Amino acid sequence: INAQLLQSMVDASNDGIVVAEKEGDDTILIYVNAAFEYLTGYSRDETLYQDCRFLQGDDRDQLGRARIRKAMAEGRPCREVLRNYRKDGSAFWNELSITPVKSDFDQRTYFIGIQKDVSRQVELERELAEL
Amino acid sequence: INAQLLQSMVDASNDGIVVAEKEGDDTILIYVNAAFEYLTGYSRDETLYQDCRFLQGDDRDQLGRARIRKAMAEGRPCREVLRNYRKDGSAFWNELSITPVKSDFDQRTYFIGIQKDVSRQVELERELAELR
Ligand SMILES: Cc1cc2nc3c(=O)[nH]c(=O)nc-3n(C[C@H](O)[C@H](O)[C@H](O)COP(=O)(O)O)c2cc1C
Numbered sequence: 001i002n003a004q005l006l007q008s009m010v011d012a013s014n015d016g017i018v019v020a021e022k023e024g025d026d027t028i029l030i031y032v033n034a035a036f037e038y039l040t041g042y043s044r045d046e047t048l049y050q051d052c053r054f055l056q057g058d059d060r061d062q063l064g065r066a067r068i069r070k071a072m073a074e075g076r077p078c079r080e081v082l083r084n085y086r087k088d089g090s091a092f093w094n095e096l097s098i099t100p101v102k103s104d105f106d107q108r109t110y111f112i113g114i115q116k117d118v119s120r121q122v123e124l125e126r127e128l129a130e131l
Numbered sequence: 132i133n134a135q136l137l138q139s140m141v142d143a144s145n146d147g148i149v150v151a152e153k154e155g156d157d158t159i160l161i162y163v164n165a166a167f168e169y170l171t172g173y174s175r176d177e178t179l180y181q182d183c184r185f186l187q188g189d190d191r192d193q194l195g196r197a198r199i200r201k202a203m204a205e206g207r208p209c210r211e212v213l214r215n216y217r218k219d220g221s222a223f224w225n226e227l228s229i230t231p232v233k234s235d236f237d238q239r240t241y242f243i244g245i246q247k248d249v250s251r252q253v254e255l256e257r258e259l260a261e262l263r
């Protein structure tokens with residue numbers, strides 16, 4: 001399995017896949033896939049080198065950002081569900097999966113983020129409960 | 132992005148990711164990530180070098196197969212929602228995504244599969260429609 005096949009495996013992923021490096025208090029993105037651009041509504045040019053905190057908008061009082069911050073500082077994987085907002089403003093429920101990985105090229109730990117949209121299932125459970 | 136990061140991105144994927152090659156009427160597997168092992172219940176040793184039609188079991192009557200065979204022969208991506216069964220026999224709705232790709236290393240057309248489990252979503256919508 002070569003890097004070309006691996007790259008196309010990433011581009012064919014249903015969930016969004018991003019890679020982010022740490023720059024102090026903010027971890028900025030260095031790679032986004034096509035699934036991330038359609039999920040968030042942003043393009044690769046306007047999403048690189050910026051922390052993914054913009055997806056949270058002003059909904060900054062969530063339990064996930066705290067567990068995410070603690071796990072990354074300790075090199076621990078974590079999975080949290082966050083309420084994020086697209087460029088248009090639509091709110092989508094994101095089952096984010098962060099995995100710190102060690103790049104042997106520069107011996108720098110990078111962070112991989114898998115974004116899965118579960119907003120449709122959350123709306124189903126709420127609608128069935130109201131019935 | 133180097134090849135080590137791309138491999139870690141595949142191993143961290145929630146959905147199952149596999150790579151298969153064409154061997155006539157069959158399309159045997161050559162790579163299986165950890166997600167495909169937990170989702171299908173079959174180990175890498177069992178699922179390798181065999182076509183993925185075994186997940187269908189006895190439910191081989193699905194119109195998605197003819198659409199899959201058409202897309203792979205015409206080198207076109209395809210997505211189908213099929214009824215597959217794990218090793219325990221528990222049925223699960225698999226949103227399969229096949230993307231034919233040309234490996235420049237050997238000029239052989241490989242096929243990338245993305246298995247997404249949507250079992251409960253189908254159950255929830257079915258429960259919603261019956262209540263409506
Ligand atoms: C690789 C990676 C991907 C991330 N993706 C998202 C995301 O899609 N949505 C989100 O709300 N936060 C995401 N985050 C988390 C934020 O970027 C940020 O690091 C986190 O909210 C830290 O909270 P803080 O603002 O208190 O420091 C991601 C983090 C990493 C490292």
Ligand SMILES: Cc1cc2nc3c(=O)[nH]c(=O)nc-3n(C[C@H](O)[C@H](O)[C@H](O)COP(=O)(O)O)c2cc1C
Nearest residue numbers: 151158182183184186187196199213242243244246
């Ligand atoms: C990479 C790849 C992954 C596949 N994964 C599945 C799968 O998970 N479940 C399934 O029912 N069919 C899967 N298929 C389709 C079957 O392997 C097979 O091609 C299809 O069922 C047609 O079989 P047939 O020739 O007997 O009609 C996959 C095909 C490819 C190329």
